Ligand binder design. Structure first.
Ligand SMILES: Nc1ncnc2c1ncn2[C@@H]1O[C@H](COP(=O)(O)OP(=O)(O)CP(=O)(O)O)[C@@H](O)[C@H]1O
Ligand SMILES: Nc1ncnc2c1ncn2[C@@H]1O[C@H](COP(=O)(O)OP(=O)(O)CP(=O)(O)O)[C@@H](O)[C@H]1O
Ligand SMILES: [Cl-]
Ligand SMILES: [Cl-]
Ligand SMILES: [Cl-]
Ligand SMILES: [Cl-]
Ligand SMILES: [Cl-]
Ligand SMILES: [Cl-]
Ligand SMILES: [Cl-]
Ligand code: NA
Ligand code: NA
Ligand code: NA
Ligand code: NA
Ligand code: NA
Ligand code: NA
Lengths: 327, 327
């Protein structure tokens, strides 16, 4: 067994539960993108640990969060590598499910360094089998993973949507603070199904695009983002945060006047996974007892630091690396 | 340890040694090839076990060969998966090397079923570090892997060329029968380095293109294949076999009059890895004491069965599938 084991006495039960995606990133660096029919060699290759779910759990885990990952991987070596990597990043793996019928989810990523361009084929694989019915069957209808002591749920939109919406509803009904990062951007049919579950979303935390698609409010800047915030309170979301890249974020705690905090000024070398860093860091700081604005201010600093280095999860800070006054 | 362990006496020492490549094949099925900058999902995914070295060892292992794979893979789960798969296909893994500094070799393969076009990026990864110096350091200057019992070495051209050439020379100097399948096709500077090593090759087994590049004879058919055989005997190769796809193969055993045997008449579904199947089968049948012609007739039948099914190693025959008199 690679995975963690629960106690009979609930003594390692987490503060934060992440129900979402784990994907291996197969990154081939190419002199050119291949044309139809082409066989070519990479110049280099890098194996990474991705999926927005795992990225968020690892951002929190790296700052010391009592965080557990709930997901589906293979019985393959990739799954075993992911389970150990989560543990080395401070994430509990007791509720990582494994199937012998599917490979671990992965992204096949080609990077042209010269052109900086990317081609990506997502192969969710085992992730496609991470259904509400399997989740229920393995957790006694959510009782094994939604203990009384559970403070936060984080979901994204990189597993089957019904698993995301049913988990958010069940966690909200038990008084868990539910965080939903609607990434990648929901398609029109996904928006129709999300909208009725927004009353169960304690914190909705999209980027500009994702806010635009859910609200119909075109978000390009602060003023429009404040409109999108009001629209999401109307759809029944208690707390709203919208990230704005280098422009930082806007938020509203329980319908109080919006706030803009701008981005940190930093030399951005590689922004990959910055948003996942922001979300996981934000929830970590709220679990330590920070209010939403104090949490998001520090999450903004953590994400700024991540964009100064390559590596997605490898660019997420540990507490010893942070400048004084972040932790 | 997933890998086999050699015994103090060497009671499980192999008849056939394969020194070559192990690549995982990561196959993403797509509705269209990705354009520069595109992120898409696959319609389907398949993980296969490839690399010409491993393909040739597994063709032999599936028929019951006492074969051992010498290669480099990662300490990653993909390396552990390959080592187990080799064992399940009757290949000894005691001299599989593992590096913590590189991933397991792999091919990232995109297949558009509709257009039936491919895009392939080959990531040799750990294979690029499988050097003569590393091999000598790990095997006491080849003593550990070239024991007196050893009858056959098979090499290809899918690992650093100096590793392939030095292994052939050392094996042939010990009275091992050396088999060299110069695939993939040698580049002009690789042809120049190979030619002085041909006197140390017992059996050169190219396809038409490879025979063309090595000899300067334009090989397109039986007649020109026969010319290429003479040119190879002049460069000091003892036994030559040239495979001709659907037109079967030509050979000469040690300067004797060359022989043409045509292709089996079969419904070709997927020819992928047929050549590897032919080469591995051929050497198994010679280890059973068939002469070159008898071994190649049986290999031709094995490769013909393989072209009737998809899946590369999954299409290689077991002994129950072979007509009477082949085994
Ligand atoms: N150039 C930059 N400078 C400072 N902070 C940045 C930044 N880019 C991103 N951030 C920080 O990261 C947070 C999320 O930004 P964004 O949503 O662009 O991430 P992302 O993960 O979508 C980038 P990518 O599209 O490459 O994956 C921002 O709210 C901000 O805190
Ligand atoms: N269409 C066909 N019909 C019958 N036998 C065939 C065949 N194609 C290949 N073979 C068998 O396989 C041997 C090697 O064929 P070839 O060298 O084309 O395989 P290959 O692995 O290079 C095909 P691919 O280019 O798809 O990887 C032949 O000598 C023959 O025994
Ligand atoms: Cl496990
Ligand atoms: Cl990583
Ligand atoms: Cl799969
Ligand atoms: Cl790190
Ligand atoms: Cl091992
Ligand atoms: Cl396979
Ligand atoms: Cl590598
Ligand atoms: Na920790
Ligand atoms: Na932790
Ligand atoms: Na980064
Ligand atoms: Na066997
Ligand atoms: Na065997
Ligand atoms: Na086949």
């Amino acid at each position: 067994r690679a995975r963690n084991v629960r106690s009979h006495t609930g003594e390692y039960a987490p503060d934060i539960l992440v129900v979402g995606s784990c994907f291996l990133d197969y990154v081939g660096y190419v002199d050119h993108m291949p044309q139809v029919g082409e066989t070519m060699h990479s110049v280099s290759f890098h194996k990474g640990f991705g999926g927005k779910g795992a990225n968020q759990a690892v951002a929190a885990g790296r700052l010391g969060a009592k965080v557990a990952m709930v997901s589906m991987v293979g019985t393959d070596g990739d799954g075993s590598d992911y389970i150990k990597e989560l543990e080395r990043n401070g994430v509990d793996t007791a509720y990582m499910f494994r199937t012998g019928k599917s490979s671990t989810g992965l992204a096949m990523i080609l990077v042209d360094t010269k052109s900086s361009n990317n081609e990506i084929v997502i192969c969710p694989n085992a992730t496609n089998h991470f259904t509400p019915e399997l989740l229920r069957a393995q957790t006694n209808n959510y009782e094994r993973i939604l203990h009384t002591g559970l403070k936060y749920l984080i979901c994204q939109n990189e597993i089957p949507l019904p698993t995301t919406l049913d988990t958010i509803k069940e966690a909200h009904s038990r008084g868990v603070y539910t965080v939903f990062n609607s990434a990648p951007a929901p398609k029109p049919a996904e928006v129709e199904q999300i909208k009725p579950f927004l009353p169960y979303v304690s914190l909705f935390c999209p980027n500009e695009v994702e806010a635009t698609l859910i609200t119909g409010v075109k978000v390009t800047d602060t003023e429009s983002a404040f409109s999108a915030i009001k629209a999401l309170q109307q759809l029944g979301v208690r707390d709203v945060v919208i990230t704005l890249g280098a422009a930082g974020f806007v938020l509203s705690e329980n319908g109080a006047e919006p706030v803009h905090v701008t981005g940190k000024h930093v030399k951005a070398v590689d922004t990959t996974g910055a948003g996942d860093c922001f979300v996981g860091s934000m929830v970590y700081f709220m679990s330590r007892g920070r209010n939403l604005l104090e949490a998001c201010k520090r999450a903004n600093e953590c994400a700024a630091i991540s964009v100064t280095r390559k590596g997605t999860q490898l660019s997420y800070p540990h507490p010893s690396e942070l400048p004084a006054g972040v932790m």
